[PDB]
Homo-oligomer: A and B are copies of this chain.
Amino acid sequence: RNESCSENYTTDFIYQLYSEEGKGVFDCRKNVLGHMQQGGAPSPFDRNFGTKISARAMEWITAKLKEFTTDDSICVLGISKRNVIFQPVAELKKQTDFEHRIPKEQWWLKLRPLMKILA
């Protein structure tokens, strides 16, 4: 359960519902993982990820300084599809759900049917 997926249907709520309706068949246990999810040592992927984009970003900074500013001077360097691209924050505003602080369009949602399939 995502922590903020529902205001009323909390972790406790879901636990109670499953517990009660499952009584003669199964019992439940509830766990809230917490800040341990920030991890200990970074995964190899995260190490390389940080390393790489930071290197490229700094390249961009150096290119910009080698030339007072506009809108393309303030960017987010992100991964889109197969490339890492620079996006002015102004373009990203319309691409943002500021109320819930999530992107309006998220690729991985397309993988949702897989859960049920892989049971």
Instruction: Give the residue of B10, B16, B19, B34 whose beta carbon is less than 8 angstroms from that of A33.
Output: B34
Range, interface on chain A:
10 to 19
Instruction: Give the residue of B19, B32, B35 whose beta carbon is less than 8 angstroms from that of A8.
Output: B19
Q: Which residues of B have CB within 8 Å of A30?
A: 34
Minimal Cβ-Cβ distance residue in B for A20: B8
Bound complex: CA of A35 vs CA of B10, how far in Å?
19
Instruction: Give the residue of B8, B31, B34, B36 whose beta carbon is less than 8 angstroms from that of A16.
Output: B8
Nearest chain B CB to A96 CB, angstrom units: 25
Encoded as 1 (CB less than 8 Å from any B CB) or 0, chain A from 1 to 24 comes to 000001011101100110110000
Given known contacts A13-B17, A33-B34, what 6 new A-B pairs fall within 8 Å (CB)? A8-B17, A8-B20, A30-B34, A31-B32, A31-B34, A33-B36
